[PDB]
Design a protein around this ligand. Structure first.
Ligand code: MDR
Ligand code: MDR
Ligand code: MDR
Ligand code: MDR
Ligand code: MDR
Ligand code: MDR
Lengths: 237, 237, 237, 237, 237, 237
């Protein structure tokens, strides 16, 4: 057991999907996983383990922010033998052509956090996902009839940033989505020799304000989970 | 309502206690508050509002990490008229004389996060608590027969830091406890003109390893809540 | 003796009040101290030792700037057994509400200097004063019927800064006064294990642009001194 | 024409392969391109344009260092309509498993330079290659039965660094190869909206200390070129 | 008059020699200048104006540290028509071959202060002296038969630096002397359009720990003054 | 031989003139040196050795950028006995009074590169040239009747800087010319124990956008060469 995970080696699959909303852990378990079992409840961060088409998979939230997800991803890697971590969440878009409900795959992740500089002797560490996982997610999406967008995400420490102009810089450099974990998870993965990938659906615009019915979300959300799960099966091949 | 708080102005008291463990919100509500009511459940972050000796008070978790707590504290201040925020949690000690179960009041808060530099034009912003709140907590503790320790806390972005030596620097500079929110909350308070204070009980040593029975914790925890709540009443005077 | 202080262990009291102007030290000693004697003259940085209501007390200028006061405070602590240092000076206001002749107690101090970053491994070190000393100062003020504002000061390296935009930043984040020593003195207090406090009187308002020099301004300066001196008496008890 | 390129819009193909050694460009053009003609000679930075299996292709050295390649890639993109840039060079390994003659595809690139910080408001910009170009390169390698490692490269500013400790840091975080251009080229691609990729062959192992120069090493260099050229053909389809 | 100087235009010469210690300014005036007249006493920072071989000259202390010297140099340049500032202070030696009483001309000045970074958008500003003034000092020394090393000085913010290893870095890069003003004075000269030069007398050796001993605190301190004064005459010619 | 130079000790003179463009190195050799002999061709970075008025002299390109020039200067200093490096390149003017064809002597060199910060523990290293070499150039110019400004140069990493406003900062602080090597060369000279000086010919004006036009690309470029060569002779004397 670890400080934030009351479980033992083997309780988690070697692949773990992690939503930002804690409530989504249970939802994913009862909707996509078979024969699921609870493996953690520490601090209310419910963790589950089951199988998807025979493949063992676990699901558990990571909390909002690099600090929070750095804890869970780290403990899972070093103490529970986790090899892959797929973050499934939302993101705000700064580009005009990126619309709500669009699926973005963060091959890379910029950030204004200092965690990676702390790790890389104050130099620039390119926080990146595992290449194979990226391609697995892209193909999985294609197979479902979805055209995902692959590029850079921006992991912000402040949802309410005082530097509004930074969003302009993000757009100017091709940032596809703004979230709050990617860079941190990728940093942890590199630090402890694991693999990671972040998949997000555009929840809103950081310049205007589009609209998406309640159904659209729940539907696109299921689509994102399917992409993640099927990407794992492609990876196993 | 806000992105992370599904409530309206008035649903929260002007004073809010915020634990790091989400589960503690409900516990505090049913143990110390009277006539409590649920005011939020978004993303599973239960929020409650009641009265303590006639004084209106709300309680709700803030999540682990500066990013997470910066969201909640901000939304509460700007959209729900909150004037005071008291964080109640745990902390790791680096000083030999600071023992487990000790109560530490963070008058100041150092950090390795970049949020404050982002706010202060890359200069040094002294993340501090409201002075009156600090003295209210100190006196409240005294009245309960508890000698609190007042000084600097260190808000770390990484629970599992690669820079072990930094803990040596912390000890050399009088850091009383290492946690993961203070500096961020104090930053938000200064940014939006509110008042904040962080109170923590030593959960462990970052050099050795003492011991505290399960009872000791639950007991000292109740003590910390009492200190916080009574400090509010002293502030009202 | 030291390179900057030509005196011997014992000449100084364990409590030293330090104004920026060395001629101000002479003023303080002759005005408030009984049986005072000059204990230092090096570089014209006058130092004195006498008694206030029977208590042994010393006063000595610290020169302008963090680099200057860092030397004198350090030497007083490591070579003259000084346990407490109270800076009594002036500052410029940036807050509309902060008026001329207002007494400000710097519980914390922000800064443009990099001295604390050098000390704190390039991270954010919250330069704060000793809690008890702040409490004694506030209680002393109250006793004298003098209102006192407790908060953050800003220790600038350049009295004539090339970027006036920082002033709006200070105002936005609640800085009570701009001086040039507090942050440095607190760094030294932490590094060498001593206690320090900074008290200042608003001599000018950078906002409406206005200085203060008259019987009223000189009356307020004396009040600050009285606050400092009486605060140590309360501390002794 | 430009200050560094004495040619006209149309002389270069929309895809340019760029080695660090200008003499290497001559080698590539004569070895793989048909009906190739020199399109630039300024500063001895030879440039050529020809066809590979009917496809118009150009090759031109980029000089050593981020500052050098930043100029040429920028000009090619903004003044010569170049849409894709493929860097084909060498790198030094730090990972025990990465062997000599191994082909490394830099999906991302870390760095000691501050060029991207200047571009990204002093925050962390993840310098990454174009996903499709990386995918085409990997598929091309596969077709040639050539194994290829996809990951992070490290673009150093100093071939002779004063701090060898950074090498252990690179190894700990999985850097596949150390070169001196990738991070800069990716920054330029992002700033000016173009697509770029860096491919390299391990010419030396900084670990066991060993270079590679022979028929086998030259065979591997040609494979990298073949990979690059064939990757563009796949992209066209 | 200015904030820190009670005088009027014309009270100072167009060239001002400035030692860190006000008492040394007084010594210089009484020893080298004829018709010496005190022009300032604010904060005890003595300033004098007189003649040397018919040439009007001023000498005034600047206090310890960059923040202090920046004030006086600025005011002199913008309100008193000062064209040349020649600092005549002391310094600590780091190089083995540099001994006490040695004269050093700082054509350049390194520093760990943030003032120049504040002025130069966080980039590296090479704080250098006026070339003509440098040559004048060299020639002056030659004529007087006094040895003088021309090179880089280090302007430290902390006389009692917590980073001892930095001295090794200074030595490796040939820093001739360690003081606390050069880089700042040069920053002001460039910002406010004036010329400056720093000349120092090795006061002590940082390695051997040998301070200014013997009656060699005069003649040597005088050599520096002689050179500075004679350098001015050469410049006038 | 070295990694980037195919030659042996003795193949180069103890003094090497270095232009950024290899072709200009070739021009210098054939135009100013007798018995010119090509000593290197690796990567096309032409190097030559011959005699000028009886004095053995070498000239070799260093490529564009700090990373490039650092390599060649380093290798020459540690493996070929080079004692003096005199860069003879071009530069862009920011000051209104500086016109094309103007000669500039960089006694100092500012920069936005991180190389010196890497060498100097993130502090400010004043990248300066060798004083004697500077004076030799001034005197040489005087004798030849060629005007020359002695001052600060700016070594930029990005020829196509995204920060246009920085040019205004350069101008305000009197930067004579903008190039891409000075600060780096000086960093190497100090690190590896050698002497260097950078002389540049205003190639274009950053404001007016006037490039090197007319047949004035020779005689002027020659003045620079004449000064550099004659400065060496003076130094030998
Ligand atoms: C403006 C902004 N910044 C950061 N994250 C944002 C955002 N707008 C939306 N998000 C998304 C992604 C986060 O992970 C999530 C936080 O609730 O919402
Ligand atoms: C080593 C370390 N770092 C940061 N926080 C620590 C810690 N040891 C204990 N804590 C405490 C305070 C945090 O808020 C909490 C996280 O679960 O545990
Ligand atoms: C407006 C302002 N800025 C910086 N320092 C100030 C100030 N007003 C007063 N001071 C204080 C601190 C210094 O020690 C001194 C400088 O005049 O007075
Ligand atoms: C070990 C090492 N370090 C830095 N750059 C290296 C390298 N091995 C190869 N390179 C590459 C990138 C440059 O363009 C060039 C320098 O020799 O080769
Ligand atoms: C060892 C050392 N470090 C820093 N500054 C030093 C020094 N020795 C002498 N000085 C100089 C510069 C200051 O202005 C002055 C303070 O005593 O002496
Ligand atoms: C305008 C400008 N900016 C940066 N470097 C410049 C320049 N004009 C000329 N140069 C110089 C220095 C480089 O080594 C070379 C590149 O063309 O010319």
């Amino acid at each position: 057991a670890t400080p934030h995970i009351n479980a033992e080696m083997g309780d988690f699959a070697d692949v773990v999907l992690m939503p930002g909303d804690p409530l989504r852990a249970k939802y994913i378990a009862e909707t996509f996983l078979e024969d699921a079992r609870e493996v953690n409840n520490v601090r209310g961060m419910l963790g589950f383990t089951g199988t998807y088409k025979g493949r063992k998979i676990s699901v558990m939230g990571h909390g909002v922010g690099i600090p929070s997800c750095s804890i869970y991803t780290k403990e899972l890697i070093t103490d529970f033998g986790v090899k892959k971590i797929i973050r499934v969440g939302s993101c705000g878009a700064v580009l005009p052509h990126v619309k709500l409900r669009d699926v973005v795959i963060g091959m890379g992740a910029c950030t204004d956090s200092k965690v990676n500089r702390i790790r890389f002797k104050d130099h620039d560490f390119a926080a990146i996902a595992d290449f194979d996982m990226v391609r697995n997610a892209v193909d999985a999406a294609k197979a479902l009839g979805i055209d995902a967008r692959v590029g850079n995400l921006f992991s912000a420490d402040l949802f309410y940033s005082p530097d509004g102009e930074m969003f302009d810089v993000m757009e100017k450099y091709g940032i596809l989505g703004v979230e709050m974990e990617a860079a941190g998870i990728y940093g942890v993965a590199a630090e402890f020799g694991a693999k990671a990938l972040t998949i997000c659906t555009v929840s809103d615009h950081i310049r205007t304000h589009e609209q998406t019915t309640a159904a659209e979300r729940q539907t696109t959300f299921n689509d994102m989970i399917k992409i993640a799960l099927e990407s794992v099966l492609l990876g196993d091949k």
